[PDB]
Design a protein around this ligand. Sequence first.
Ligand SMILES: O=C(NC1(c2ccc(Cl)cc2)COC1)c1ccc(N2CC[C@H](O)C2)cc1
Length: 334
Amino acid sequence: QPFIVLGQEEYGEHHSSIMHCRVDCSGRRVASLDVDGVIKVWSFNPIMQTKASSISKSPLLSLEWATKRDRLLLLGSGVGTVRLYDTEAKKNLCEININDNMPRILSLACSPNGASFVCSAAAPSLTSQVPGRLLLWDTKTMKQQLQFSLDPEPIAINCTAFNHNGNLLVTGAADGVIRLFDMQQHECAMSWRAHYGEVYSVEFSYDENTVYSIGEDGKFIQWNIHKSGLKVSEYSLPSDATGPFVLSGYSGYKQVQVPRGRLFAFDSEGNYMLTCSATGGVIYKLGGKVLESCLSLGGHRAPVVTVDWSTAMDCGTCLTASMDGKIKLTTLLA
Ligand SMILES: O=C(NC1(c2ccc(Cl)cc2)COC1)c1ccc(N2CC[C@H](O)C2)cc1
């Protein structure tokens, strides 16, 4: 067995379906956001303890931790704004209007060196062909520097990830296209059709010879980063990995969530991958003629919609978040 399960705990302060759940850079704090606009900052080591909590008056759609200033958290709204929140001072340092016509801040990514961040800003959802923009910001001044043109047309970018040094940014969009941006030259280095439907999550492999993606068509694909649109491997995931995630009752009433947060997460070496399931997290060994689960974390009574995996002090922690608002924290030893 690759992992020893040390334990499983539950964080139950959210009373609404989870949108996002991310561990900070220190590997000690979580910022979780639910669909009611409640943002919680909490610790889990040595015990579960809420550090900060707030109800947003306006809609909140994305969150991203700072990479050098651990306590700083970026919050993207649904009213065209980016909030910088100091989790130690329990106060907003600023709120900047990220222009107009595109109020949905769907994605936020902080560059590894701490000098910049990117955000995706999209128009209201009317069709799948809805316009969007990709903005580059300076963290020192909290000012927008530029906007990257998207070809063939403006489109909603759903997910963003930087590579280790921060000179490349991989993005996934609502048109199913993956765009790789050179961050030194500020241009699209590569782009290809990745999915038949929306791209939900993107990540660079640990060796950075590939990029992983998960999309609306239910596929988990590994792409060759040196040869545009060339596949390294491809897998059809179970439907409860990509949703729509549905929570029903006996009332006729049901809640339906399409992926918004991280749909996959990786161990420190990028050899294992954590995914969603109706019952809890499912981990697959990567590089294995189909893909088979090696660890099922369980513990959920409502569909898991977003996951995270962090490693700190040679101890891995898996976050699995569900539609009833429950967040399970599974401790994994190598
Ligand atoms: O906190 C500010 N920057 C730093 C930073 C680091 C990481 C991230 Cl992700 C974002 C920002 C650069 O080191 C801290 C910071 C705070 C307030 C500022 N205002 C307030 C009034 C104006 O809007 C400028 C500017 C800048």
